[PDB]
Symmetry: D2
């Protein structure tokens, strides 16, 4: 036979191993409109109606946003917008209340509860009113038969909605 | 009540959703030694003995390499090196053969098969011999009771070994 | 050479493939005690204090319940019970309210919100009072540094608490 | 207010938690045919040609087998059978060799290596020949663009083929 010594410069002792990694996909929507009816004297919402243009989704990656519009997700061709309609506001105190409404995603509609947190009812710089507030809640993909082809393994059944709102009085 | 118009500049309609992502962890080892006995006339390995200093692991991220040395992985304090010992080379042709040997990781030992692919038996620039060759194979973490605390879900039971070798004749 | 025909009776064309399956682990606790202070005239809880003997966990499989007591979960030796202490009840209406309290699991304590749903305030068969009600809420394993070794992949970070209560007046 | 004592008989302190569980799906095929050319004097295969009726899949659960025929898997309407064609047998010894061939699944074709293990070349009860042997190997779903909609997370990219064969001489 014959004996050899490695040449460490052009020798590689390598391995490959596959692991899973959980992560949050976080996005907003650039285009939406809403109607806000709110009584500062009693700190109660009276009407809250929101429409969100699915096309305007932004999850900081253009190739995924496009993918979102396709049949296995949003179907933005057939269903161009998602809507929220307040049916009930149940007051907890002046900072806090429980908002019930109807959400529609791709033409399927379910009633949801959002947690209203009033973050400051001011009379702004110009003598005209402002308000801050947040709406927070969790919805289940399965309740809206959303992304039904994608397993609840790969992508979570749970979607967390955070809506942060500044808003000025009308006219 | 009262009516408000959003101020889109300080309003955010956001969502968070958790998804899984598979990925390969790929690494080498910077420090190892081997003994290579090989007969160019018959293109057969005669002896292949390798020792790899666990401490020298490099998976291009220093905080994971450290973690690798801990009890839930390598136990590098107690078991500072991993070893491979050839017990058998079964020739397929002059380019190809099936190497059987004993691998020991953290003091547990199993016989493995690697796929030997001879990538070129030359007589180098100076009149003295060289050889290229690769060893490739898959081993199961469970066979070596490796990382036993980490599920076969989070991290794959399968480890793929690629060893790429250039090597010069002795003395 | 030579030609052969299969004998289908002792021939098997087989395959193995690994897949993931999500599932709910659902359990109760057989031994716990509570203190219930409740005013039927205003349908408000005044005091709700609960202690649950970790040892009495029942997830319909004895080998997992034992495992639950070990260091990588409950540490039932060191921390034999988990406790809930009401700090606040915020009334929504006569059927509904938001209970805030302190939960302690393995000596770590966080304030939680449970959704109180009063399911029927009767005066029972004997002339003495009864009440039904449920408490429902979600807590995050990570908030209580629970099962910290087990990834949020293998086991969900989210735990759903359902407490169903029938309860009779005292003495 | 008022004080209550639980009625433990109609009280339940419950929890729900979601976890993942890996498992093997194991199946065979009830209907297939093959052509077997084998030389006992040199223990070499000469020809091995197999066709497997996709329709005859059996993974011990009828509702999954049906599902297997659909577009997101087999497409059994369009592609009713899968085929294996031996292109090469490389002998290791009289018990062992490396079989290369072309596998076609749903009209996509890749060359694969199977590990031939001869388990006993007898002359049977009646004076006519028999042979046992196994073929074993791993193929990647991704190489055959199989189940492309199903992630490599939910279902493994790796498929393990075990073929166990008894076989009698012809005519």
């Amino acid at each position: 036979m014959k004996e050899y010594t490695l040449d460490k410069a052009h020798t590689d002792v390598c391995f490959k191993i596959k692991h899973l990694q959980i992560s949050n996909v976080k996005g907003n929507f650039k285009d939406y409109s809403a109607v806000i009816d709110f009584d500062p004297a009693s700190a109660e919402f009276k009407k809250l109606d929101v429409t969100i243009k699915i096309a305007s989704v932004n999850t900081e990656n253009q190739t995924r946003d496009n993918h979102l519009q396709q049949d296995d997700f949003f179907k933005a061709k057939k269903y161009p917008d998602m809507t929220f309609t307040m049916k009930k506001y149940e007051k907890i105190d002046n900072e806090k209340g429980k908002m019930t409404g109807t959400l529609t995603i791709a033409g399927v509609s379910k009633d949801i509860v959002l947690d209203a947190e009033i973050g400051g009812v001011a009379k702004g710089k110009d003598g005209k009113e402002k308000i801050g507030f947040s709406l927070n809640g969790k919805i289940k993909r399965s309740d809206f038969k959303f992304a039904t082809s994608t397993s609840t393994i790969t992508l979570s059944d749970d979607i967390n909605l955070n809506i942060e709102v500044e808003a000025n009085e009308k006219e």
